[PDB]
């Protein structure tokens, strides 16, 4: 695992081409996340 950029605790990936994309995020320490919900699902075939 890499380190956070000096002076930072995470990276934010801001979308800069696809105007509909939301942001993505990276942390470099496993302790900075807690898996709160487990969601079981299927993708649905469009009609």
């Amino acid at each position: 695992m890499a380190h956070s950029p000096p002076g930072h605790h995470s990276v934010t990936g801001r979308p800069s081409v696809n105007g509909l994309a939301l942001a993505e995020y990276v942390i470099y320490r496993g302790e900075q996340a807690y898996p709160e919900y487990l969601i079981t699902y299927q993708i649905m075939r469009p009609e």
Partner: protein, 161 residues
Amino acid sequence: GTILIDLSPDDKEFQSVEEEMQSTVREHRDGGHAGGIFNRYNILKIQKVCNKKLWERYTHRRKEVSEENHNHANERMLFHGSPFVNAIIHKGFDERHAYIGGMFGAGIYFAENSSKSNQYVYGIGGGTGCPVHKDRSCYICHRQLLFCRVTLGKSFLQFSA
């Protein structure tokens, strides 16, 4: 020490988690190659993940970040899709769950878009799809995502394509 508690579909907590899942689906630039072709999900179950040790590990670290960032953890709820979802919920996130080849370096990646995390459930690039039918767009096989509490602290902003 992990236990999984089912939420009832009647529970407001089920309903708000479902809504975040469904409302953050988008179309992907791969035309569905990695994650499948779909505009919405059939939610089959939502469980609350309870582990005291793992929770205290998280809050300990959250307080450290917070104290380094004018008492602001900058906490978010974000999706994570992984072949390792079963190890994550029992042992926590660690270096083995990192995306070694990700655009922002080897770390653990999360998404606001549920459909983006869906692209990693069967591996990077969707791997070979579901174990049963080898289909990245399988409409039958049951998938699992995590909806996670993530401490961002002071976050480095990368503009990118």
